[PDB]
Amino acid sequence: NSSLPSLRDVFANDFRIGAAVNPVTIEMQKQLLIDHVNSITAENHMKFEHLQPEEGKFTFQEADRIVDFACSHRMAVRGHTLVWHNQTPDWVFQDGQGHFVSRDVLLERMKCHISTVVRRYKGKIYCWDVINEAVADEGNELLRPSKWRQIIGDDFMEQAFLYAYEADPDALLFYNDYNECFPEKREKIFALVKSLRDKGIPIHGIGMQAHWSLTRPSLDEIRAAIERYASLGVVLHITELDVSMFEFHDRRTDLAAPTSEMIERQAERYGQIFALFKEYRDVIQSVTFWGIADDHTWLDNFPVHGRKNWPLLFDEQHKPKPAFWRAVSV
């Protein structure tokens, strides 16, 4: 590593380079993070259930440790995430009686959470994934079902963005989602963000999660999605990048190591992706990987529990993989 290029430095004129972390991986992967990144996202500890597990019980200790680490290494922080259909406790939607709460009560609870969390980190966190994954990932409807949407109505997203803007009007506010380059879902995401900007809602950016495979989305699909979203005038962040060794249909559990062909194709794929991101450096301002090295990745247990995946630029011993050298040489 002594003579290795530093990712944040190679890309200094193009975009920030980020990693998702938690307090345990900050300790386990500390030197890689120090050597390579200039942005951090909490993998889990700024989600609703990890910040307000019971009403009026806020548990900021883990998030605080992550922000302290970033600020002491001059790293930016992306806040992830305020309003999502997952990892939100049931209390949020329920009354004492158990029944679903009203629209007005859920809006009050949404405003209080957003206000308390965003004001705590104002001046340290420069952007927030305000809405995560509201667009349908299947079928013909625009929006996924969720209790937020069921109880408030379809303007729940408008309200979330307005509450976050009031809490920190200097933050950049994002709509964040995955499968963002598949054309049908891209058109839904575009339509949604267009309609919010067309009402004056303070949505400043689109977060492209980029939970990609070796084959999907194609490079033409990524190009088309970057152009489509940039044409709205928003900022783009690539927010959760990883390149899975398995396609969505491949649910094998038996592989104890990637083949040479997988390792070589992943290297080619990461070179191709970074060349494209560099080509769109005027609209992409940050690329965050959902991790930093193959000793920790959510893809070990998703979408198949208990297997192993090798999705990042560094291996389990924190050494650069063939993908690293192609990524940094674009």
Task: Please name the amino acid found at residue 62.
Answer: E
Question: What's the min distance (Å) between Cβ of 265 and a copy of itself?
Answer: 5
Which residue minimizes CB distance to Na ion? 281
Q: Mark the segment that binds a copy of itself (CB under 8 A) among 21-29, 41-49, 76-84, 259-267.
A: 259-267
Helix (H, G, I), strand (E, B) or coil at 117: helix
Closer to a copy of itself by CB, 251 or 319: give it. 319
Closest distance between Na ion and the C-beta of residue 16, in Å?
A: 9
Beta bridge partners of 286: 16, 237
Q: Which of 267, 273, 284, 312 binds a copy of itself (CB under 8 A)?
A: 267
Tokens in use for 172? 């950049």
Q: Which of 240, 264, 268, 316 is catalytic?
A: 240
For this structure, is 184 an active site residue? no
d(CA 313, CA 68): 25
Residue 143 contacts a copy of itself per CB under 8 A:
no
Is 326 one of the binding residues for a copy of itself (CB under 8 A)? Answer: yes
* DSSP H stretches of helix in the chain: 7-10, 23-28, 30-36, 48-51, 61-72, 103-121, 147-152, 156-167, 183-198, 219-230, 260-279, 322-327
**Residue 4 or 34 with smaller CB distance to a copy of itself:** 4
319 binds a copy of itself (CB under 8 A): yes
Please report, as ranges, the residues that interact with Na ion according to CB under 5 A: 15, 281, 285
CA distance 102 to 22: 35
- Evaluate whether 189 touches 161 at the Cβ level (below 8 Å): no
From Na ion, a copy of itself, none, interface partner of 122 (C-beta below 5 to 8 A by class) = none
Of residues 281 and 319, the one with the C-beta less far from Na ion = 281
Least distance in angstroms from the C-beta of 10 to a copy of itself:
9
CA distance 281 to 236: 10
CA dihedral 222, 225, 230, 235 (to 10 degrees): -70
Question: What number of other Cβ atoms are within 10 A of residue 189's Cβ?
Answer: 26
Q: How far apart are CA 244 and CA 212, in angstroms?
A: 6
Among a copy of itself, Na ion, none, the one that 281 touches (CB under a kind-dependent 5 to 8 A) is: Na ion
The verdict on whether 133 is a catalytic residue reads: yes
Number of residues that bind a copy of itself (CB under 8 A): 18
- C-beta closer to a copy of itself: residue 112 or 214: 214
**Least distance (Å) from Na ion to the CB of residue 14?**
5
Work out which of 60, 91, 298, 325 binds a copy of itself, going by CB under 8 A: 325
Shortest Å, Cβ 39 to Na ion: 13
The Cα 75–Cα 312 span in angstroms is 20
Closer Cβ to Na ion, 44 or 285, answer by number:
285
- What is the nearest approach in angstroms of a copy of itself to the Cβ of residue 261? 7
Q: How far apart are CA 279 and CA 283, in angstroms?
A: 9
Nearest to 327 by CA among 289, 300, 290: 289
Rounded CA separation 42/60 (Å): 12
218 touches, from Na ion, a copy of itself, none (C-beta below 5 to 8 Å by class): none
Residues that bind a copy of itself (CB under 8 A): 1-4, 260-261, 264-265, 267-268, 319-320, 322, 325-326, 328-330
What residues are annotated to the active site? 133, 240
